[PDB]
Amino acid sequence: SAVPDFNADSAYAYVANQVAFGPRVPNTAAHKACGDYLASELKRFGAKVYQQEAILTAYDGTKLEARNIIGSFDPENSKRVLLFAHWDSRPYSDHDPDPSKHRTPLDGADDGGSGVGALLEIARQIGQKAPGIGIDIIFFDAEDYGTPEFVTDYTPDSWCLGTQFWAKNPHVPNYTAEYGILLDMVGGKNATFFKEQQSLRAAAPIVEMVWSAARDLGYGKYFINAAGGAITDDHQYVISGRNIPSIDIINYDPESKTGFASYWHTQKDNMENIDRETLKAAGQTVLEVIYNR
Ligand SMILES: [Zn+2]
């Protein structure tokens, strides 16, 4: 139609390809190899790719060799939409039931892999058929290296470090877009995306447009027509730092102890939860919106 077909098999394979490297922990070989892969994949689609490298400081003082990866399509268009996700994997499994796993990196299949894999498939479609507005795909680094449950000292703003850096130092001067859409944990079987509070406060028309498109397409069992909780995530820093109204599409459970999927920040954030039908619902909705709303 006006709108390309999101190939969920393809998105799933992009998730699997990330996970295959090993956990994408900043400073590791797996992180460097996966980042190189992500950059090359955006370039093959025809994006103008920027690799923003910066040394960021984690809550414990670790210097992180961070790399935000930006792919820009129709780069001279002043009218743009930002689509983003984090690509790092957490170095801890600090919600794992087994204390011997708390200090072990997780695969981050849903928490990292899913949003990036959905965006890779979206970007693949954009490369084949221009939507008529500029699109920037951003994979933000060092999102999930915040203070773990077993550390008692507090550090403000310890999450979303790559986004914090970019928002202050964008890849092009005074970068702006009409709106932003973050995908985070968009791969889990039977995921439920509620209207997140920061998204509504900053960008209710964007929320409404996306949730209505999802309903039009038949994905209302995923895009729940209800208010969710407030979630700390990369979009808050895009809102505060670049003044781009942005939303978060994220699996939320209003009755979970953490608000997240059962496997969040555990060793079970692995490929077994990833589901083509969930990826399809998220990805096709985003295509509908950027091409056709
Ligand atoms: Zn996480």
Side-chain angles (χ1 to χ4, degrees):
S1 77
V3 186
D5 192 346
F6 179 93
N7 182 323
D9 282 344
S10 169
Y12 182 101
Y14 286 132
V15 183
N17 288 348
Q18 293 167 78
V19 171
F21 289 101
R24 280 73 64 223
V25 174
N27 299 346
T28 68
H31 186 270
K32 294 175 195 302
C34 187
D36 290 358
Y37 171 76
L38 294 175
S40 70
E41 198 74 17
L42 291 172
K43 190 165 173 167
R44 158 182 304 122
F45 304 151
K48 182 179 176 61
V49 174
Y50 308 77
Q51 300 183 57
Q52 174 177 69
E53 296 178 284
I55 312 295
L56 304 182
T57 304
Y59 74 95
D60 65 355
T62 305
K63 296 297 174 179
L64 305 180
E65 301 179 319
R67 175 165 48 165
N68 299 318
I69 305 166
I70 302 100
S72 302
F73 294 98
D74 192 5
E76 304 307 321
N77 199 330
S78 63
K79 307 199 205 80
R80 313 197 65 73
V81 170
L82 175 62
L83 303 178
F84 59 114
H86 84 95
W87 72 274
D88 62 309
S89 305
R90 184 148 177 81
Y92 315 121
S93 304
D94 51 321
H95 288 263
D96 203 276
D98 181 353
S100 292
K101 297 299 184 177
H102 286 170
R103 290 164 186 74
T104 301
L106 50 75
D107 277 344
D110 200 19
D111 194 349
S114 67
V116 172
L119 288 182
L120 288 167
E121 174 57 19
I122 287 160
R124 190 175 71 99
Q125 296 304 324
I126 293 163
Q128 295 166 164
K129 184 183 195 153
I133 50 155
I135 303 293
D136 304 295
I137 306 291
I138 306 186
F139 307 143
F140 288 114
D141 202 3
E143 179 279 334
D144 220 8
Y145 215 117
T147 305
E149 295 295 286
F150 56 80
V151 166
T152 61
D153 270 10
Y154 180 77
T155 302
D157 300 295
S158 77
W159 308 87
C160 308
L161 297 173
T163 306
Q164 290 180 64
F165 180 84
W166 174 85
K168 178 179 175 49
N169 299 284
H171 63 287
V172 297
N174 300 122
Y175 175 80
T176 195
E178 300 300 299
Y179 63 88
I181 301 172
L182 170 60
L183 304 183
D184 189 8
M185 297 186 87
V186 295
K189 191 182 170 65
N190 298 318
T192 54
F193 312 133
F194 285 76
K195 301 180 187 177
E196 184 280 322
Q197 286 297 318
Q198 300 196 85
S199 299
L200 284 165
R201 199 72 165 83
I206 310 304
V207 177
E208 292 300 312
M209 171 178 63
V210 171
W211 265 245
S212 287
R215 169 192 64 210
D216 295 336
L217 296 170
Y219 300 127
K221 72 196 193 82
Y222 297 94
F223 289 83
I224 309 303
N225 200 21
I231 301 170
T232 300
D233 215 344
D234 291 300
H235 67 311
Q236 78 188 53
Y237 294 102
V238 173
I239 291 162
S240 65
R242 305 267 85 243
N243 199 37
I244 299 167
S246 301
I247 74 166
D248 195 358
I249 304 178
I250 178 166
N251 190 3
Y252 174 76
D253 183 348
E255 316 299 331
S256 170
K257 311 158 92 170
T258 66
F260 299 121
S262 64
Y263 53 80
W264 173 74
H265 288 189
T266 80
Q267 286 286 286
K268 285 187 177 166
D269 186 8
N270 64 26
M271 287 300 303
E272 307 180 40
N273 306 120
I274 304 299
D275 186 273
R276 288 164 178 83
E277 283 55 73
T278 307
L279 290 169
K280 179 61 166 175
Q284 194 65 50
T285 298
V286 170
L287 288 176
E288 184 72 25
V289 169
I290 69 179
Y291 280 81
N292 199 38
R293 294 292 186 290

Short mmCIF file of all heavy atoms in Angstrom, two decimals, residues 111 143-144 264-265, ligand 1:
data_model
loop_
_atom_site.label_atom_id
_atom_site.label_comp_id
_atom_site.label_asym_id
_atom_site.label_seq_id
_atom_site.Cartn_x
_atom_site.Cartn_y
_atom_site.Cartn_z
N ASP A 111 15.28 -6.66 26.45
CA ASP A 111 15.78 -5.39 26.96
C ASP A 111 17.06 -5.04 26.22
O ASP A 111 18.17 -5.32 26.65
CB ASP A 111 15.97 -5.52 28.42
CG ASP A 111 16.15 -4.23 29.16
OD1 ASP A 111 16.34 -3.17 28.55
OD2 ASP A 111 16.15 -4.34 30.42
N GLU A 143 22.52 2.55 28.25
CA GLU A 143 21.28 2.83 28.90
C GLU A 143 21.09 2.05 30.19
O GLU A 143 20.40 2.54 31.08
CB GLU A 143 20.11 2.54 27.94
CG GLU A 143 18.71 2.78 28.52
CD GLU A 143 18.12 1.71 29.40
OE1 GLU A 143 18.51 0.54 29.21
OE2 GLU A 143 17.25 2.08 30.27
N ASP A 144 21.64 0.84 30.22
CA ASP A 144 21.22 -0.16 31.21
C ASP A 144 22.38 -0.54 32.16
O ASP A 144 22.42 -1.67 32.64
CB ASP A 144 20.63 -1.39 30.53
CG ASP A 144 19.44 -1.94 31.25
OD1 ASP A 144 18.93 -1.32 32.19
OD2 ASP A 144 18.95 -2.97 30.86
N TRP A 264 12.60 -9.42 33.43
CA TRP A 264 13.36 -8.18 33.37
C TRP A 264 14.53 -8.19 34.38
O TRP A 264 14.35 -8.49 35.56
CB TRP A 264 12.45 -7.01 33.68
CG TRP A 264 13.11 -5.69 33.83
CD1 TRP A 264 13.62 -4.91 32.84
CD2 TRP A 264 13.30 -4.96 35.03
NE1 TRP A 264 14.08 -3.75 33.34
CE2 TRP A 264 13.92 -3.76 34.70
CE3 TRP A 264 13.01 -5.22 36.38
CZ2 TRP A 264 14.23 -2.77 35.66
CZ3 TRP A 264 13.31 -4.26 37.33
CH2 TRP A 264 13.89 -3.07 36.96
N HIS A 265 15.72 -7.91 33.87
CA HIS A 265 16.92 -7.84 34.71
C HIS A 265 17.21 -9.17 35.44
O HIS A 265 17.74 -9.21 36.56
CB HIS A 265 16.91 -6.60 35.63
CG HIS A 265 17.15 -5.35 34.85
ND1 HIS A 265 17.36 -4.13 35.44
CD2 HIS A 265 17.23 -5.15 33.51
CE1 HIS A 265 17.54 -3.22 34.48
NE2 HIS A 265 17.49 -3.82 33.30
ZN ZN B 1 17.17 -2.96 31.44
#
